């Protein structure tokens, strides 16, 4: 209930869950969805299907604020990130562009054991 139309869609994939946040031309979120927002509670939350549903839920809800066109921004890798980038393209919203902006350090903090054994 503002009527935006043009905006951004942040897809935050991960090996545990996917969460999409839609925003206005300059960052402030309009609506957000995830694997939890919808049914799924544990492992299920990750799965590409969930990512899909969540993507859609995100668009549908954003359709209300009158959204139409969006720029997609993918962050991270995980259980079905592409499905999300697809459910959007189909959701109805015209996807203006998909862009990987997954953060990466130029080597700063020692990661937790679980993510070390590398170099």
């Amino acid at each position: 209930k503002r009527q935006v139309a043009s905006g951004r869609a942040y897809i935050h994939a991960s090996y545990n869950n996917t969460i999409v946040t839609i925003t206005d031309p300059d960052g402030n979120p309009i609506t957000w969805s995830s694997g939890g927002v919808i049914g799924y509670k544990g492992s299920r939350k990750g799965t590409p299907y969930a990512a899909q549903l969540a993507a859609l839920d995100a668009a549908k809800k954003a359709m209300a604020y009158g959204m139409q066109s969006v720029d997609v921004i993918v962050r991270g890798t995980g259980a079905g990130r592409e499905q999300a980038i697809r459910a959007l393209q189909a959701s109805g919203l015209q996807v203006k562009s998909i862009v990987d902006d997954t953060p990466v350090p130029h080597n700063g903090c020692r990661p937790k054991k679980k993510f070390r054994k590398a170099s």
Binding site: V74, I85, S97, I98, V99, D100, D101, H106
Partner: protein, 73 residues
Amino acid sequence: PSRKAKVKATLGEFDLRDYRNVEVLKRFLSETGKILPRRRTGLSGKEQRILAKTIKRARILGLLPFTEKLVRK
């Protein structure tokens, strides 16, 4: 394969030491602020080693990026 074109050949006689030639330096950067490997820069161990310092110097001055976002995906 990486047989598209050596950045070196696709260019003139430049001073690898010059840290302000944004024009040419920008040529050795990936589709991100990343410095290309010799495989693609067509430079040599020594040349390529001098580029790095130059491309890094240029980054501090703000002329060259440290990293750019990827489009498509």
